[PDB]
Amino acid sequence: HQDPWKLSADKPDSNNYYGETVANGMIGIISSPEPLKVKEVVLAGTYDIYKRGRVSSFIPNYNLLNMKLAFNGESVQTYNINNYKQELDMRNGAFTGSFQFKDLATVTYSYYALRHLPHCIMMVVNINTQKDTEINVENLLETPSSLNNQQNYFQNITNTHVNIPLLTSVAFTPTGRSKIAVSNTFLFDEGKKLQPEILHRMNDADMHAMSFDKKIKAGKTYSFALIGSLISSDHINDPYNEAERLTIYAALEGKSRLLNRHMQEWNSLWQSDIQVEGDPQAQQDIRSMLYHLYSFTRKSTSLSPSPMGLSGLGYNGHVFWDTEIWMFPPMLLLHPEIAKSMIEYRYQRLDAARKKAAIYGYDGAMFPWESADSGAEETPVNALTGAFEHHVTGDVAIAAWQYYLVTGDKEWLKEKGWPILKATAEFWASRVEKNDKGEYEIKNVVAADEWAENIDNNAYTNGTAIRNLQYASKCATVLGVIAPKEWTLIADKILISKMSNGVTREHDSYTDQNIKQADANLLAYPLKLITDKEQIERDLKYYQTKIPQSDTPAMTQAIFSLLYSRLEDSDQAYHWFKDAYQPNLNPPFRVISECKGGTNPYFSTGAGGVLQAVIMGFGGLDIDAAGGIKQVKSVLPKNWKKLTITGIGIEKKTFVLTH
Amino acid sequence: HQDPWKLSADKPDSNNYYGETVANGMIGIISSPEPLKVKEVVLAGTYDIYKRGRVSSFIPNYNLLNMKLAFNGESVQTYNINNYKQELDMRNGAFTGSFQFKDLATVTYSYYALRHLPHCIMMVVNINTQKDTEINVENLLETPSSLNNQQNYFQNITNTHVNIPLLTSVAFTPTGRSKIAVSNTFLFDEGKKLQPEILHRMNDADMHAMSFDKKIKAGKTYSFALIGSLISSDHINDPYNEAERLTIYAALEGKSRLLNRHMQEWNSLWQSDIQVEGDPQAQQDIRSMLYHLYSFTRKSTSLSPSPMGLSGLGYNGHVFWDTEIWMFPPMLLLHPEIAKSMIEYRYQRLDAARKKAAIYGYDGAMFPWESADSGAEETPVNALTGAFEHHVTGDVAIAAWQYYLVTGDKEWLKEKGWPILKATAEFWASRVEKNDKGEYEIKNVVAADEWAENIDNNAYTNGTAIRNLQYASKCATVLGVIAPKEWTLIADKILISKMSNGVTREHDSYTDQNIKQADANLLAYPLKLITDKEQIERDLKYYQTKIPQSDTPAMTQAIFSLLYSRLEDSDQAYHWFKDAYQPNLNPPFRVISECKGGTNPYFSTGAGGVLQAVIMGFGGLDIDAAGGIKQVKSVLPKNWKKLTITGIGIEKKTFVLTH
Ligand SMILES: OC[C@H]1O[C@H](OC[C@H]2O[C@@H](O)[C@H](O)[C@@H](O)[C@@H]2O)[C@H](O)[C@@H](O)[C@@H]1O
Ligand SMILES: OC[C@H]1O[C@H](OC[C@H]2O[C@@H](O)[C@H](O)[C@@H](O)[C@@H]2O)[C@H](O)[C@@H](O)[C@@H]1O
């Protein structure tokens, strides 16, 4: 079960099953233990009021691939199939199931979120017969209870060469904010005269279906595909006509062309890769972490991943600093154009951040704790993070500057980076208060350690303000512009304190409390305000005892690991690398939950930090404060014989580490 | 677990659990295996387009009892309770759960669909603690995905003596056809000054909650109740205000008064009962059947039960001949005022039946195959029973005449019976076709055996037409009005044909096909057109093996039982009695599914049938064609020592049978 490219499950157990996702950064499809079904489908960029939090959310969408298959009268179910297996090929995001039906046929089905066509999905079904049999195939378009005012359509698009049957639905998100259209068709190899007639049934208020029968003789293979397109008014003004147009298009491109395009784009993604010799389980795990970040992001866009990417409704689909600090750094090293999309998401919401700042009495741009379509604040109001966790504004500025450092694109710095850095720094200049002693303070925040609420001088928050003001000043110099001299004066006197045991104090009320996740330790990495190895070690040893086993998210141990690799302590780095995700795993695909023993995968934020422990920690790779990627001292786990990181930085460098 | 009054389950197993229902003929609440939750709630009379069949349906409603209980911050879960038991007390429809929380406290909760107040529910909670502790109690009002455009309110109703905190939700059925209001409050014993402060949270789009803490001292019992009122625009013009009014009212009546009234009404229902000696399983099973009918009906109304009563969304809540022929006859004998509501339902829908006949080119009234709010046809269009299964009209007439036979109420005959009998006979007079031989045919129907579709001269349909015409004529005689002599001429010449072996032919195309359910046999009972014992017997011998084991509903073997009891064949009567329901049971409460090994309880139609096998078969009780209840020869199961039937007919007779 440790193939380095594939995740395998024999005989799915529906009582203990967490499905895996295929996605193209726009549509995610989460697997079902049941054959020829999907559990959930999510469309990026489509938000409406729905359940959790009383604020916008991703919306469960059409399970557009759901199919029912019958042989010689008899419905294929979990209960009457044998040798059933599922597999995720991470090389191309193919999810495959396969089974035997009695004495009649082997069935294999593979589905894909087509990597070049953001709104298109394809399933390919192969029937190999051991006896003569007749199949009945049905594709169902059930309108999920999250949508309303559905309409169920069917038509034939024809010319002399083709008969393309379209099963279409149109419906609305709960408040009517977004109109969703889905349109499906079957592709056959045999051509218009010989293809099965397609029947259409509309027997329920919330479900219609298209269906056909086909006689297959013993010893033959019969194939067909299902193509579906899924789009909304958030993506295009006329989703109904756009859905049908895209499914027509894809049908006339055909399976072969579509898959070849899919494959070419996946191949390009895997040109940046991490290879580990001597530890197959690590190898597979790290490939799964890469796979998920590649599936949940998309070059050449303004999309940014939620903490759970497209694996479901985790955190409502909202964007957090989980992007900037956790998922963004490994992507920026491996595929900068992905990082470009993530920061583009913020650039386009700068005006919304300006608006927040004005509503809360500050200058500049105040990015929201949680962000969705507009870029306004979308945190549930019962969570004090929304009003008071303010580091996110500095987190956005850090990643913007980092983009510049790694790409050296001064054209992007002038047009997009500087507007961000300038406005965020104007926010911090307005956010601080000078005291009698000439120090600057930032009072009344929720810490990165979110258990500490309405406290003063949070170490991490204070550190991001310092960085934000310093990077905006560095950027003004790059661009030949005059920065407010106040920005450096402030950065230099923002308070960061130590306790009497010589440990960095997390906040002004901090003595010895348990903490939710890493905060003071983040000044060592990523912020690198603390670079004295003794201080790093003092702070590690103190805080590593303060994280409880329960209810603490995977935004911690990866950092411990990373700093221990930078201090060249192999055993401890490897201990914290495993502890970061292994306690969080869900069967049968080793997906990652947010917290230890949790049941809410897939926490791509978690994957993002572990990838940093691997690349920046074991690989010793580092964004150089002066430009590009450098390599610092590192160690490997004892049992890893070789680590190979490919496609790094704009020179696409390969790094090989050994003992 | 064979208490004759109580159904009981130890340690509910959620992987194999079919909940039991409490109901007052208006609201039904179906149990959850989870402590202090309910699975589903259904309000009678509220219909909208929703899922199955693309036609009107009962809607899942607010799970208004749902409660969360914590002890010093620790919520109750499966893994921290023990000695968890559930019980349904059939004497008063009380559903009770009980459990122990760790070794700290014991908890019981009993809930009720209050019998006298159709729109009000009550749950009483009792907590006995060993040590000092603090409880947190939350009542959650989650808007189900079946409803839309919800609003979540909370307010305090006060005077010098009380503070009634109301948690209210108002929402709409899928098309906006019905507006639903729910309003809950907590009742305390301790009085306004000492009662807990109630907090309100609205943290989700689709859920709000009211909560309180309370300190309980070591060795003391703390008791509180939750009252809920659930009502719609189908029942009142202003449900929002009526729901709050009703809960205020119930709150100031108080628990004690509310339960006393409930008990009195249940006590009356059980004045008609069936007692079996020598077979405890039978006794419990039969009580369960009576309980479900009593719970799923209501005297002094125009309500009629669906095939699944208020147990869920079975057959979309629609009314079928399952009332008139299956549920109605035991209710007529035991509690005629329940039968009076069932036929009232048809009386107030006579104009819609006249409209149906006109639209399908017939005279008089043509009752729909499936009925709901208006009395128009509600059968899903994909089912040819809607257009072609016409015997329903004669089934309505039969029940209307029986009502008169049993009660002797000639004032009702004039006002309500005769309108029905006259219009329904006018239908049949227009529905027959005379042939060259002077016989009357009824062509192109779906048979009671619904596997026979678009066939001629169905036995059961033809018999219901004869009976309809005869009984209309007799009604005319009683009332002194002139009936068409054609009714009698047509009745006496409607075709009922024999095969060469002398067996009643099901329809003109019938030879030896398997059949879905009893049809020719129904001519013996209930119609009594076949009285000759050798004919009854030859029809039984031919047809009894024609019903397959699978996918055949519980509308067959109860009739075989009854007929064998009338033929004085104890072994066969008892064989069919058990076969009618025991292969259809689901755990842990022995609820009845529609079919053998099915999974869609509670099929109240199948219970009605069995209750006829017991009352009319084993008890020998019969509606006398001349008026009243008579008794014919019968036999008991060998192992039954005594069968006692109480509350029969308008004189409330007790029948006792022994070997
Ligand atoms: O989506 C809202 C909010 O959810 C998570 O936080 C909930 C509360 O958790 C506690 O740990 C913390 O003490 C509070 O400050 C939080 O409101 C999430 O961690 C948070 O980032 C989200 O905004
Ligand atoms: O509510 C619709 C319909 O449901 C059930 O019938 C479905 C089909 O069942 C077959 O067995 C039969 O041959 C057909 O005539 C039916 O349409 C139900 O039995 C029926 O009464 C309902 O009207």
State the DSSP string of B428-493: HHHH-EE-TTS-EE--SEE-SSTTSEEESS-HHHHHHHHHHHHHHHHHHHHHT-PPPTHHHHHHTT
CA A603, A604, A605, A608 dihedral sign is positive
Asked if the Cβ–Cβ distance from A145 to B148 is below 8 Å, we say no
Nearest of B396, B414, B412, B260 to residue B336 by alpha carbon: B412
Phi first, then psi: what are they for B380, rounded to 5°? -50, 140
Nearest of B572, B573, B601 to residue B586 by alpha carbon: B601
H-helix segments, B144-238: none
Q: In the structure encoding, which two tokens stand for residue B363, read together?
A: 């005279």
Beta strands in A64-147 (DSSP E): 67-71, 74-75, 81-89, 94-101, 105-113, 120-129, 133-142
Name every chain B residue with its beta carbon within 8 A of the beta carbon of A171: none
Question: Could you tell me which residues are beta bridge partners of residue B179?
Answer: B172
For chain B, the 3-state helix, strand and coil shares in percent, each to the nearest 5, are 35, 25, 40
B411 CB-near residues (< 8 Å, 6+ apart): none
Asked if the Cβ–Cβ distance from A174 to B380 is below 8 Å, we say no
Distance CA A247, CA A43 (A): 17
Beta strands in A273-363 (DSSP E): 274-277
To which residue do tokens 């009404």 refer?
A: B265
Distance CA A61, CA A47 (A): 11
Q: Coil, helix or strand for A516?
A: coil
Point out the ligand nearest to the CA of residue B552: 2
Terminal alpha carbon distance of chain A? 28
Entry resolution (Å) = 1.6
Distance CA B350, CA B360 (A): 16
C-alpha count within 13 angstroms, C-beta hemisphere, residue A243: 25
Query: A557 with A588: CB under 8 angstroms?
Result: no
How many CB atoms are closer than 10 A to CB A410?
A: 14
Ligand 1 pocket check for A516: Cβ under 6 Å: yes
Q: B521-546 burial string, b = 16+ CB within 10 Å, else e?
A: bbbbbbbebbeeeebbebbbebbbeb
Phi first, then psi: what are they for A35, rounded to 5°? -65, 140
Q: Which member of B52, B53, B205 has the closest CB to residue A54?
A: B205
| Omega before A144 within 30 of 0, i.e. cis | no
* Encoded amino acid at A461, one letter: T
What is the secondary structure of B535-586 as a DSSP string?
A: HHHHHHHHHGGGS-SSS-BSSSHHHHHHHHHHTT-HHHHHHHHHHHHGGGEE
CA A385, A387, A388, A394 dihedral sign is positive
To which residue do tokens 């006896």 refer?
A: A131
Distance CA B572, CA A303 (A): 72
Q: A469-501 burial string, b = 16+ CB within 10 Å, else e?
A: bbbbbbbbeeeeeebbeebeebbebbbbeeeee
Q: In the structure encoding, which two tokens stand for residue A29, read together?
A: 């499809």
Query: A436 with A493: CB under 8 angstroms?
Result: no
Distance CA A556, CA A580 (A): 7
Distance CA B172, CA B380 (A): 23
Distance (Å) from the C-alpha of residue A626 to the closest C-alpha of chain B?
47
- Distances in Å between the Cα of A567 and the Cα atoms of A333, A368, A527, B282 are 22, 35, 16, 77
Q: Is B594 labeled as catalytic in the residue annotation?
A: yes
* Encoded amino acid at B601, one letter: P
B416 CB-near residues (< 8 Å, 6+ apart): B343, B344, B347, B400
- Distances in Å between the Cα of A125 and the Cα atoms of A519, B89, B517 are 50, 53, 40
Q: Which member of A51, A202, A205 has the closest CB to residue B205?
A: A51
Cα B597 to ligand 2 centre (Å): 19
Residue with the smallest CA separation from ligand 2 atom 8 is B383
How was this one solved? Answer: X-ray
H-helix segments, B270-296: 280-295
Ligand 2 pocket check for B515: Cβ under 6 Å: no
Distance CA A288, CA A607 (A): 9
Distance CA B228, CA B74 (A): 26
Distance CA B479, CA A649 (A): 100
Nearest of B611, B318, B324 to residue B467 by alpha carbon: B324
- Distances in Å between the Cα of A72 and the Cα atoms of A213, A214, A219 are 10, 10, 16
Ligand 1 pocket check for A450: Cβ under 6 Å: yes
Q: In the structure encoding, which two tokens stand for residue B375, read together?
A: 């009395």
Element (DSSP H or E) covering residue A581: none
C-alpha count within 13 angstroms, C-beta hemisphere, residue A303: 26
List B450, B453, B534, B568, catalytic entry: B450
Packed helices A533-543 and A557-566: angle between N→C axes, nearest 10 degrees:
150
Looking from the CA of residue B316, the nearest atom of ligand 2 is 1
Question: Could you tell me which residues are beta bridge partners of residue A121?
Answer: A113, A228
* Encoded amino acid at A378, one letter: E
To which residue do tokens 């920046």 refer?
A: A616
Q: Is B450 labeled as catalytic in the residue annotation?
A: yes
Question: Could you tell me which residues are beta bridge partners of residue B112?
Answer: B122
Q: Which residues of A touch B (CB under 8 A)?
A: 15, 49-54, 145-146, 148, 174, 201-207, 380, 382
Distance CA A574, CA A639 (A): 10
Ligand 2 pocket check for B451: Cβ under 6 Å: yes
- C-alpha dihedral over A49, A51, A57, A61, to 10 degrees? -100
Q: Which member of B53, B206, B382 has the closest CB to residue A51?
A: B206
CA B42, B48, B51, B55 dihedral sign is positive
Query: B455 with B432: CB under 8 angstroms?
Result: no
Point out the ligand nearest to the CA of residue A514: 1
Packed helices B557-566 and B533-543: angle between N→C axes, nearest 10 degrees:
150
Nearest of B518, B597, B491, B619 to residue B550 by alpha carbon: B597
List A40, A377, A450, A506, catalytic entry: A450
The rounded radius of gyration (Å) of the Cα atoms in chain B is 26
Query: B280 with B322: CB under 8 angstroms?
Result: no
Nearest of A396, A390, A376 to residue A47 by alpha carbon: A376
Q: A206-238 burial string, b = 16+ CB within 10 Å, else e?
A: bbbbbbbebebeeeeebebbbbbbbbbbbbbee
Distance CA B449, CA A218 (A): 38
Query: A305 with A327: CB under 8 angstroms?
Result: yes
Nearest of B545, B538, B458, B532 to residue B502 by alpha carbon: B538
Element (DSSP H or E) covering residue A29: strand A27-31
Q: B86-104 burial string, b = 16+ CB within 10 Å, else e?
A: bbbbbbbbbbbbbbbbeee
Asked if the Cβ–Cβ distance from B205 to A15 is below 8 Å, we say no
CB-based burial of residue A98 (10 Å sphere; 0-12 exposed, 13-18 middle, 19+ buried)? middle
B269 CB-near residues (< 8 Å, 6+ apart): B115, B294, B335
Question: Could you tell me which residues are beta bridge partners of residue A260?
Answer: none
Distance CA B202, CA B192 (A): 25
Element (DSSP H or E) covering residue B182: strand B179-188
Q: Which one of A147, A172, A204 makes the best mutation probe of the B interface by having the most chain B beta carbons within 10 Å? A: A204
* Encoded amino acid at A31, one letter: S
Question: Could you tell me which residues are beta bridge partners of residue B476?
Answer: none
C-alpha count within 13 angstroms, C-beta hemisphere, residue A60: 14
Asked if the Cβ–Cβ distance from B148 to A382 is below 8 Å, we say no
Distance (Å) from the C-alpha of residue B149 to the closest C-alpha of chain A?
8
Distance CA A74, CA A50 (A): 39
| Omega before A165 within 30 of 0, i.e. cis | no
| Omega before B602 within 30 of 0, i.e. cis | yes
Distance CA B7, CA B11 (A): 14
Nearest of B369, B356, B289 to residue B322 by alpha carbon: B369
Packed helices A418-431 and A391-407: angle between N→C axes, nearest 10 degrees:
150
Point out the ligand nearest to the CA of residue B377: 2
* Encoded amino acid at B114, one letter: L
Distance CA A38, CA A26 (A): 17
How many CB atoms are closer than 10 A to CB B609?
A: 29
How many CB atoms are closer than 10 A to CB A380?
A: 18
Q: In the structure encoding, which two tokens stand for residue A32, read together?
A: 């079902």
Angle at A102 between CA A100 and CA A106, to 5 degrees: 30
Phi first, then psi: what are they for A472, rounded to 5°? -60, -35
Q: In the structure encoding, which two tokens stand for residue B637, read together?
A: 């199961």
Q: Coil, helix or strand for B116?
A: coil
Binding annotation of A for beta-D-glucose: 52, 321-322, 369-370, 385, 450-451, 516-517, 551
Q: Which member of A15, A145, A204 has the closest CB to residue B54?
A: A204
Q: In the structure encoding, which two tokens stand for residue B547, read together?
A: 């019903």
Nearest-Cα residue of chain A relative to residue B174: A148
**Cα of A287 vs its chain's centroid, Å:** 14
Cα B453 to ligand 1 centre (Å): 61
Query: B229 with B175: CB under 8 angstroms?
Result: no
To which residue do tokens 């595909």 refer?
A: A225
CB-based burial of residue B480 (10 Å sphere; 0-12 exposed, 13-18 middle, 19+ buried)? exposed
Residue with the smallest CA separation from ligand 2 atom 7 is B383
Distance CA A196, CA A520 (A): 65
Ligand 1 pocket check for A360: Cβ under 6 Å: no
